[model samples]
Target: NLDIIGKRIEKIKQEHETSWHYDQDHPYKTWAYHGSYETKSMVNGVVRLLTKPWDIIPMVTQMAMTEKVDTRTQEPKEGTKKLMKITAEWLWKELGKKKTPRMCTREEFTRKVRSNWKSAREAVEDSGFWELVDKERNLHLEGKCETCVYNMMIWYMWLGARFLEFEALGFLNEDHWFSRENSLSGVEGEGLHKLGYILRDVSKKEGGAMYADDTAGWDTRITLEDLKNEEMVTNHMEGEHKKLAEAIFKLTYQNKVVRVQRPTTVMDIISRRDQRGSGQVVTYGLNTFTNMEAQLIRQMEGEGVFKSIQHLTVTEEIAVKNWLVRVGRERLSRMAISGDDCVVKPLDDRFASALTALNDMGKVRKDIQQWEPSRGWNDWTQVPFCSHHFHELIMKDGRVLVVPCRNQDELIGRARISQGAGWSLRETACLGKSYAQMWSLMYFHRRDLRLAANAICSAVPSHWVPTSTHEWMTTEDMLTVWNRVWIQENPWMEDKTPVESWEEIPYLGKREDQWCGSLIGLTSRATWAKNIQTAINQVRSLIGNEEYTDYMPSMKRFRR
Candidate 1:
């Protein structure tokens, strides 16, 4: 039992030590444990007195005065009146004196007294206090109570002395303690307005410029209750508080006691002429031509090709507007000019001459006219011919003149002129005549030899021709021009017997059969007509009549 009792006692002592020991890292420890007095402890003591003054009042009154006995009468002598007077004066200076109106009602007097007392207590508390003893001792009731009262008095006196020093040092300026002033001033509209101005300037310097219109009357009648209810206002105020804190720290660090000047208002910071009307004027464009037009205008302006100025003027009513109409109109005009100049010139003169010739002939004039300027010749409604003169001339003399024309229109007009003479352009163009009749005869003569050689060699059928005259002719008057040249080149036409059989004609049989086939395939029918006469002569010589040789009887006849 003894051992158990000792252990319990030890544990209790440990608990007591742990509770009472100073924590070196604690803010309170710096002043509380050391010789320096702690302002927080005094504040705690005053708080305790305010809530439970019954214990504090008696203790303070007893300490304020002393009791002495008279030796002759064995009765209590009068206390130190001067000392009491001094105590009263000290209390009045620290706590302030109350006033009661002469004609006030009992209820009014009671209210007035309570209000006065509350104000006085708060004033004394706001000054702040400090601890007397380094560590609290004497855990018993009367001793603890006595220590508490003594500490309160010490803190009160310390606060009073510090305030006196503050006044002497000129550290009690309104700007120096603006936060405190804000709190004490209540939530008045004018005070909040001033606060708003100061903070607005700070926000702008930080690159968050809020327009006056956006924040208009933002500071009006903004109570503590309002901040509590509205979260945005609370957040803004918190940010402002941080800026104010930084400014205060900067000001205090430069001097022993800070004497702050009022911060600049928002308008004061923003009103400089340099800051106004200096922003870029951004104008958007339409989705199409307007968009392109605007882009061109802006580009020209940038390159100094066009002069453009946008002036934003603030009117008497503080309205802001811009001007860009003149520049826009100029851009439109330039765009129109560009469109006109960019158009392609009419096609070459050849097309125009052909159309004019067709129009004069009155052959498909409307059809040819439709192809003017930009429309293509292929787009014409009717097909055009080469020449009409070739058609009529070929009928009269088996000849026609070939002439190159620009387009189908000119060719069609020449053909129409021959149509009246009872000759078609196709027939006239294929008269099978060269510029000289002799040249034509020579060509026909050579062509006939090739056909006869091919027939004898069994390379081709005897009646085959290379192609029809209509199939090969491209111009209307080609035959007449060619025949004229042919007659001049050749004076006489010789008729030779065509070879009948390769075995009978030793010289003709020496040529390759493929060569003969190519000749027959490439030669014309008019040339083959001459070769038939020669072939008939050779047959007459071989068999004494116009009859095929026995070996050549089996050869295939040429089909059209």
Candidate 2:
């Protein structure tokens, strides 16, 4: 006999199928990646490369722009209080004078501090130094479960999407190991692992994952066509019965309703009478013809129609079509960001535009928030090379909320460096709260600011086309485009490889008492418990559910 878990899986699958958009037996949905580039010529070339006639690219670029100046690269202004303080402090130290509260030169102090900070951070990271710290702080706990149902729920949905995608693609042939036909196919396990990694990467790269209400997973809603039919019959029965009937008759005459046979009686009722021998007239009966008329009458009585009256309407039909189109468009857009979307655009134009947009917007996000970008000079030296990392932390509900520095001078220096790099800044959520919720995101870049604006504009699809051009583009065509653009502009380093370096940040603190993962180095169980309690309180407050306070506090605990 199968286990309870097996039965639950079966039930979930059945429920999921109702909401699946793709047909049960189709090939896997095709996916394409669109990269973004910065230069206008590159954008134009990409656009020309990707699009064809008769495609609808949802152009979601905004025309926003900002202007800011960077002063970090500038020389210190003459004889200001900052300048006096810096010079005085240096003179006193250099002359070996007895200790005096003297100012330091702006340039000298900045250079010294930045150098020192860089050296310290680099040494810490290079020495395998974190290992010793980890060893010194280990926290072990007694038997407990700490996992959350949320993770499993998320995993289940992700798996479902992939499985359904494959099924829809029609590659679920039983003969193949990865196909649906293999009863013991191992594809599910491996496929889910790969999928989870992809999602996590995408979430981190993009603005984290989008959440859906429970019903988003299911698709068993009524169709608009059914609704329209019901409405037609309802109109005939209600206040406009005669008008609707005439329209229906007209349609029938036009063969729109598919005529079964000619009506025996033109009048509403068909009566048959037989005379008895005793001169008493015996009545037979009156009944409508077995065709569209009868069908319409039954629909009016709410008995014959296949769909409900509420569903059968022209407006509702139009709404459903629009909804499907919007959803499909949005999905495709998602693919471009953090590398996922529905309908893949052509590889060249689509990917190039997306990346370029991201690069520009990254700067813009910094600018609008009045945040500064990392100085490239501090590349290997700075603790955090980019504000992008801190922005992500703030976006994730971090304790600091935003990055902190030692003093105002550092902040000014950061801002100047950011502007010098051609970045912009902005605030979040109408500038209401310094903190932003998950959705209240704002950025600094305008989507329309193409680097080679004219060239990129020309490259965009004149007509709809397939998403990729690998098969169509000949070597000669590529060479011709390359010769015309790259030779003239030399805007980008054609030979340089794209950057691929990444850094992994550790979690804020240990949670061994309430969680799983690495817990050996936790120094204080009390501190970890308090952290867990804070988290629990935050969850309860946000969800307004007191029941969660008594719930398992960690992934390990919940797993059991």
Candidate 3:
């Protein structure tokens, strides 16, 4: 019983030394790169905002180079505020032990300390050992029971510090180390940082622009309850907090930062107006590059390998609405042009009126006697003159000539109107005789107009072909001639007659032989009708007999 009490006392002393003694023989060795005061402070703030301080975990494996902290210098200065903010935001959870802290070997701890501290002497001097000893001496001076240890105890405090520093500044770059900025100023600062975070935390297959948009607004107030409820606000802020986490995940996944460094003196603007050939300034397509970079970043975000981060600033709801508008317009521009039925109906009416007038004439006449110039008709030339066909008129010299429109304003206005209506002056002047012809004309003209604006002229010319003299027909000229023919044919082709409506006319050939053979053909077939049928038959025969067989075999007949 006497021997047992002495052993128990010795055991108590060992336990006391392990807990309180600053044992040099066994120091708390650590593998941690020391971070600046600012970096550690911000990290603590973020961690406090995110999780309970005691719950945070510090992982000390290696210094990740991609962290917001500038760890490039031998001793990163405290002036690196952006780096501090980012690192602080990222490391908070780790520092608070919200997650598990990483463990390091004694050798690894010593190696890391040596690497960061420059010299062993410097490492010992900076180590908080002397301070811990003073605390113990003060405890002794307070008349507490004295204890002693035969062996020194090792402490991994520096290792913990290095882990926190990595969390604060270094990007855990695939177990390597890297440094990057975290600010809203430059492309790398805001664009890259946000993009990097998204790529790490969001969808891996698709780009991270949408995810970035979503997270940037993660901290924004969407509901009234968010403002009232601290829990709701905290939850919302927590969602925003994952930004840094996602970025780390992405960088870790990619094992890279996707950086493009250039000389500091180089112009930030990719191109300038003065330097360009046409004197127009142009920026190197950063948007395109960011999109490409986003793909890789997204891959990382999906893996959940990066550290959590909050966005630089919460995006406004109004800004999102504006962005949507631009996207909508772009989508509309990409769509193919579609024809309007309303426009087609009015066009059909005009075609029918013209066709009736032509059928009444029996033969194509040189000119109509009843043709009148309407009030809406604008004179092509400023001359106080009457409208005359230049092709028909001959001068005293016995030469047929025409006068081109000389009024520039009238010409320009006409052109602008034609462009807007998807027509040329010639096409507008010449309306097709049939509904099919008119529809085709409209389709062709619209496409041509679009192509013309883009400097792409279609080979298909408009219906109103003009002579070298630039004498163009007016819409009135064509309509007037149409009305004359319609009046002459009205006696036989009454309103109730099948031939009165263009639709009642069957689309068929008016062959002379067929006309004599078939009653329908003889009564209704026209010359133009025959041309359409012939063309259709030729196309059908060509495709069925030759084209089809050449491309594929009749599979059903193969067995036979």
Candidate 4:
């Protein structure tokens, strides 16, 4: 059995590298955009190297090319290049598919996932999570995978093999992830910069920054004869394949190549560093509505979506690693400032809830933008869009933030976000009520909520009161501080209800049209800056005098 399948995979691997149909003179030409010749040629070689058989080695391996082995070269090495015939080889197999197949529909997936969410919430609150949510205002999601469709694919394929994820799992254990570059730790901007470097930068000649200290050297070296234990196989893939994988993925994705109406002028305001242009965008959702909204609001349709994507949702083996990403560092920067914190260890249920919350928050933003500006009225789901927060609207206790007529004339006619959102509107510059709309639904979303009294907003608390910085807090230290600030004296405080329900109003209950700004509190601004500076310098010593590109767009020079 092992011999049959093993021979099959080897044949498949041998064919993958020579399979490409396009090249430079031909180029990957398309309708709207085309690849740069330089970026393209390098990509072709990189692709060839990654897929070149451990049995069919492609040796000019540059940074992305540095790997010559398949790591999964599941056969043995006798320290010879010539063929060593064998009777049998180890093969990967899964249970449950031979007799019966289980296929899932999106509707069924939605149903299952939604029900599981209710179950997960019970587990969360039972573990005293509500108290934590009360403090942050947003739920913390730790799962490295960001979406349901993504997580579903991971576990589904995981049904086929365990070592399939071993390559990705081992990457987070490396030093490059947390390494500080140029006085900044791994923040989002810097994080993306390093990623771009690893994928896009064309390195110097031989002995350049190739694979790790030792490597999965891109040459076909002899591999072990059998794979009874998979740990040995994992590090092989981890060696240089992940970087090559990420590079190819990012390159092809960036080649979305969209083209539009040909502009007559060489210099149209539409193409600029500051203004809109007929070009590229890395992420979706934020600008998608604006893309086609010459304007019409569509209703939600939850049906037949499953059939079209069936082909896309299936795969195995060398194919499985393509869509995989390790997002531990990606989630870190958002948490540094947003309510939720930490990316060290992840759980899926928590992240799913936050996805729901983030989805609603961005949804409301898009929904309000659909209305005509002159209508001067709020929607059934949102408050009136306010472009300016200068004039004081309303306050639990607050004044005018003010508006600049000059800015309105020079810059925002229809604006970058085209119409009426994102600048502390709805509730003045502070946006107190609009935020309450978002935070309200998250805290009190009980499987179903009907229009009871204050129905839209239920079980919400008042704002203002921040947890300050701790000096390297440990568990007991945290409890001590909590006892002083929250408990305040009577030991029975933990047992009794010192906190009442922190409830706010629902989405359409009442818009914050006249609502003004909120002054919650402050954290140490200068102290935080000083702390980050020292952290960056310490890393400089560890890596030795090396130059790193400053990923910061504007203030990088000042920080350096």
Question: Global lDDT of each model?
Answer: 0.22, 0.21, 0.22, 0.20
Q: What are the per-residue Cα lDDT tens digits for candidate 3 across 354-456?
A: 2211112111112333232111111211111111110111223332212211122221122322122444333432221121122111111122111111110
Candidate 1 structure quality by residue, lDDT tens digits, 194-292: 222222222223111121101111122112221111111112223333232222122211111111111220100000000001001000000111122
lDDT of 2: 0.21
Candidate maximizing TM-score: 4
Candidates ranked, most accurate by TM-score first: 4, 2, 3, 1
Q: Which stretches of candidate 1 lie over 4 Å from their true place?
A: 1-348, 351-357, 360-439, 442-534, 538-560
User: Per-residue alpha-carbon lDDT of model 4 for 1-560, expressed as tens digits?
Assistant: 22212332233334443442223333122121121111101222111211122112122222222122112232222211111111011100111112111222323323433453245334333434334322221111111111111111001211111111222222221212222221011222222112212211112111112111011221122122111121121223332443432321222121111112222211100100111111111111102212111010010001111122112223321121221123212222111110011111112122211221112112221222322221211111111111211111221222111111111111111111112333322112112222223222221111111111011111111131111112112212222332343235333233322222222111211223112211112133233233433433443343345443321111222335
- Model 4's alpha-carbon lDDT is 0.20
After superposing candidate 3 on the true structure, give the runs of residues whose Cα lies further than 4 Å from its correct spot: 1-99, 102-108, 117-121, 125-560
Evaluated at residue 371, the lDDT of candidate 3 is 32
Query: Candidate 4, after superposition: displacement of residue 547 in Å?
Result: 66
